[PDB]
Amino acid sequence: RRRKKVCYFTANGITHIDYKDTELLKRFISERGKILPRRVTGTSAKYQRMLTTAIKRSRHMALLPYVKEE
Amino acid sequence: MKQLLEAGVHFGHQTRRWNPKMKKYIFTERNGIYIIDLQKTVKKVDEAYNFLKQVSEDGGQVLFVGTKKQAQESVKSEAERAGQFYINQRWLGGLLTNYKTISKRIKRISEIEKMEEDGLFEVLPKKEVVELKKEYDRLIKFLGGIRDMKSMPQALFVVDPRKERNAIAEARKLNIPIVGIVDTNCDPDEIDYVIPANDDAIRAVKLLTAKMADAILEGQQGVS
Amino acid sequence: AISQERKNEIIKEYRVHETDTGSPEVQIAVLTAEINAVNEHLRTHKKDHHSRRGLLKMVGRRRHLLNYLRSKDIQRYRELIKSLGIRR
Amino acid sequence: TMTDPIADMLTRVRNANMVRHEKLELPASNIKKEIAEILKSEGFIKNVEYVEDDKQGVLRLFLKYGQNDERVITGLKRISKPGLRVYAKASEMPKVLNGLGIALVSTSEGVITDKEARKRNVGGEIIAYVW
Amino acid sequence: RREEETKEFEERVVTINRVAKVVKGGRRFRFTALVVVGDKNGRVGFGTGKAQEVPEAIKKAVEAAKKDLVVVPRVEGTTPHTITGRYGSGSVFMKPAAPGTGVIAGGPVRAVLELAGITDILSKSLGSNTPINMVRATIDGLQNLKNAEDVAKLRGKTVEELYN
RNA sequence: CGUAAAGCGCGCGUAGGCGGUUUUUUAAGUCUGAUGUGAAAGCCCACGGCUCAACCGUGGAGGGUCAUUGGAAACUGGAAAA
RNA sequence: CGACUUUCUGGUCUGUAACUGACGCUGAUGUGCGAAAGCGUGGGGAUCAAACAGGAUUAGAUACCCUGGUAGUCCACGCCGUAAACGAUGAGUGCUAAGUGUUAGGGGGUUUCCCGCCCCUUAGUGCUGCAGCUAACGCAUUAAGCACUCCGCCUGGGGAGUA
């Protein structure tokens, strides 16, 4: 693929996170609060589809803001 | 002639897409490219050698196409050594089925070369001389040095099929036996006298052209 | 639901021999358990489409295989119908 | 579920004609071996070779092609297909292409070409023309 | 391919149309005409061409006709066997005939068969009635027609065991 | 049966139609022979007679999805076994 | 069918191949599901939005335009039962050149460790294309090719989906 380097998953697996490892939250998300989709990160489809629900649950925890603009 | 040590020069081809019709010639692909086998290459080249010499035996005539780059400097050398007419560039539309234009082309050449003697240059306004000089230059350049084409030929040699579809199809329209180099990315069955060898290599095309020129020459110098 | 535990338990008494896993008697039994389960949930949830579609497919397959065992053998049909209490 | 094996073999044969490959693979049958043998005996089949593996077949046949790579037949099809089975008497038996082609027909005594079937005055159920 | 003016010949025209090309202002037309060419002894070929006048157009069609040629497998003044022609919905169907019958077919295909030297033959046009498509289908049927010797060489056996 | 008229919205499925591979068997279909019958006139063929033709006669063939019965069992079908 | 978590529940593929040994396919009639709109019953109405009001353009505009604005859009149970419901391509089965990707897998080699790489096999999911096929456009293993079985349907347009 013409996206960034493939097999970014070398540091995670088989399942993650869901909320206990900020070491894979902040890498995969932006600074304003937005999510980084698959194009820039270079990760796979499945890991993206898990991290989606993962942030959905973690913003539930108040461990993470829905949007961080201030 | 062909020998396996001369077959060791040929290696690889262009690999962007490969026709499944010629997997039989393929030996084994490696390093990301397809390579052609050479055991059948020697036999096929020996045969095509024999047919070309037989064409030469009766007093044959053959064409040399070299429109591809990095082939012209070899194609002219081998054809002029061979003693047969030649091309290295533009095949103007129709050269084996449009005979009514080739005769007029060579006739215009025969006409416009000769007026240089009795006064053609400066013997008149700049407008016509500057036109005729560029006309002569472009005609001899993109037509080539061929001016001996008089009797319709009975066999042809080509450098590449993939560039020269239109002429190989015109020859099929004129049911002429066709021989010429065959890349691994060309239609096999459009040509009946095949030679599965590489064409990108300058040395490969040089040696093939040298051998074919010697073949045509050996067959022509004998009683024809 | 069904569960592999109870499935594997009940098939042992209805299997024609120990080593077999086919023997539609096994299949008719597990299908009957399945249809009762799905029918209880479908009475629990009146409206849906996957449930009734499924029930119809399994009932059709059960009838097809039950008719198959009607021509291979003649007592087996009877013993199954009056043991499962099914196919009135 | 496959409705007819003869249809399969004839489609395989014609689809082998359209691309021209000497070898083809197809699950064999007794009628299939017999009709393959008659195909070789007409001259359309270069060679016949049955093989055995679990369970049936698989009948491997070697096609035939002319020197200029010309297909021998110009068409090939069946007549007796399911639903509408067909039969043929001894005198009524058809001469497709006359001598040119032949008419495979199954009889009470076995399957033979069209000729012998009209010679012996015993007809049968036709299967497929060929020409 | 390989036109020859050495044999005897019989020009035969099938149809002529007045065919028009519309441009701004006037309306440009250019006549058309198709022809079939054969020596009525076992060789035939059709032809097409267009010009602004009849004689030049039909001359063009004829000079292009000899360049496409047909071997016409013939036997006993009749086609060897029966066939069906098909080309672009211009279907056609031929069948041999006992001597003394004569070619019966449509005008164009009659001209095609009369000029290919066939005496007695049975046929009927089908599908489309336009001369060009059914004529081309007729010629296509003659291209994929075979005789006893053309097949007996192919099959391992010989003639006199398989014959019309 | 893409666009021209013509695939219903789709699904579950009865009756029906169709049927994997091999063996044995039945011989219903099928193939094959005979028997009786398919009136005659008519159609077709051959001949003969009204001067010819028309016509008529003669005789032949032809005509059943026909019944009975003698055989064959590849195929369809029935049964049994893999 | 795109909010999340759980409870219950239907389907799909791969591998396996031990197992039941043809039990299969199509399938009239019958039955059920079935977009949105529409309707019955009771709530809720923040927005958005048929009917409708004002203004503006406009010869004129009850249309587009701007500002509101009810039913409606929402929920719960029933009601109806059509659509350009399309891929204008019926379902099931088998065969016929390629290359390129995508989704959920599998086998093998390359690496100290494959997670980094490659090849091979699946099934869908696309494109470019050969043969062939087509009125042509286009179809091309996700056939409109090569065949078989079964079902539906058409036999000029308007009348007319009308009586």
Curated annotation (Swiss-Prot), chain B:
Lineage: superkingdom: Bacteria
GO annotation terms (biological process): translation
Parts of the chain that traverse the membrane: none
UniProt cross-references to Pfam families, sorted A to Z: Ribosomal_S2
GO cellular component: cytosolic small ribosomal subunit
Signal peptide (UniProt feature, chain positions): none
GO molecular function, one term: structural constituent of ribosome
Family matches, as CDD domains: RPS2
PROSITE patterns reported in the protein's UniProt record: RIBOSOMAL_S2_1, RIBOSOMAL_S2_2
Keywords: Ribonucleoprotein, Ribosomal protein
Entry-linked HAMAP family: Ribosomal_uS2_B
Protein family membership: Belongs to the universal ribosomal protein uS2 family.
NCBIfam families, sorted: rpsB_bact
The name this protein goes by in its record: Small ribosomal subunit protein uS2
Species whose genome carries this gene: Staphylococcus aureus (strain NCTC 8325 / PS 47)
Curated annotation (Swiss-Prot), chain C:
A GO MF label: rRNA binding
Pfam families in the cross-refs: Ribosomal_S15
InterPro entries: Ribosomal_uS15 (IPR000589), Ribosomal_uS15_bac-type (IPR005290), uS15_NS1_RNA-bd_sf (IPR009068)
GO terms (BP aspect): translation
Keyword check for Ribosomal protein: yes
Keyword S-adenosyl-L-methionine applies: no
SUPFAM superfamilies in the cross-refs: S15/NS1 RNA-binding domain (SSF47060)
Keywords: Ribonucleoprotein, Ribosomal protein, RNA-binding, rRNA-binding
Superkingdom, natural source: Bacteria
One Gene Ontology cellular component annotation held by this UniProt entry: cytosolic small ribosomal subunit
CDD domains: Ribosomal_S15p_S13e
HAMAP family recorded: Ribosomal_uS15_B (MF_01343_B)
Function: One of the primary rRNA binding proteins, it binds directly to 16S rRNA where it helps nucleate assembly of the platform of the 30S subunit by binding and bridging several RNA helices of the 16S rRNA.
Family designation: Belongs to the universal ribosomal protein uS15 family.
Subunit structure: Part of the 30S ribosomal subunit. Forms a bridge to the 50S subunit in the 70S ribosome, contacting the 23S rRNA.
Name of this chain's protein: Small ribosomal subunit protein uS15
Record organism: Staphylococcus aureus (strain NCTC 8325 / PS 47)
UniProtKB/Swiss-Prot annotation, chain D:
Record bears the keyword rRNA-binding: yes
GO MF annotation: an example: structural constituent of ribosome
GO annotation (BP), single: translation
UniProt KW keywords: Ribonucleoprotein, Ribosomal protein, RNA-binding, rRNA-binding
Keyword Repressor: no
Source taxon at top rank: Bacteria
Pfam family, one: Ribosomal_S8
GO cellular component entries: cytosolic small ribosomal subunit
Alphabetical list of PANTHER family matching this protein: 40S RIBOSOMAL PROTEIN S15A
HAMAP family: Ribosomal_uS8_B
Subunit relationships: Part of the 30S ribosomal subunit. Contacts proteins S5 and S12.
Role summary: One of the primary rRNA binding proteins, it binds directly to 16S rRNA central domain where it helps coordinate assembly of the platform of the 30S subunit.
Family recorded in the similarity comment: Belongs to the universal ribosomal protein uS8 family.
Protein name in the entry: Small ribosomal subunit protein uS8
Source organism of the structure: Staphylococcus aureus (strain NCTC 8325 / PS 47)
Curated annotation (Swiss-Prot), chain E:
GO terms under biological process: translation
InterPro entries named in the record: Ribosomal_Su5_D2-typ_SF, Ribosomal_uS5, Ribosomal_uS5_bac-type, Ribosomal_uS5_C, Ribosomal_uS5_N, Ribosomal_uS5_N_CS, Ribsml_uS5_D2-typ_fold_subgr
PROSITE patterns assigned: RIBOSOMAL_S5, S5_DSRBD
Keyword Iron-sulfur annotated: no
Ranges of residues in domain S5 DRBM: 9-72
Superkingdom of the source species: Bacteria
Gene Ontology CC terms, in alphabetical order: cytosolic small ribosomal subunit
GO molecular function, one term: rRNA binding
Keywords: Ribonucleoprotein, Ribosomal protein, RNA-binding, rRNA-binding
Pfam families given in the database record: Ribosomal_S5, Ribosomal_S5_C
Function: With S4 and S12 plays an important role in translational accuracy.
Family matches, as HAMAP family: Ribosomal_uS5_B (MF_01307_B)
NCBIfam families the UniProt entry points to: rpsE_bact
Similarity-based family: Belongs to the universal ribosomal protein uS5 family.
Complex formation: Part of the 30S ribosomal subunit. Contacts proteins S4 and S8.
Entry note about domains: The N-terminal domain interacts with the head of the 30S subunit; the C-terminal domain interacts with the body and contacts protein S4. The interaction surface between S4 and S5 is involved in control of translational fidelity.
Name of this protein: Small ribosomal subunit protein uS5
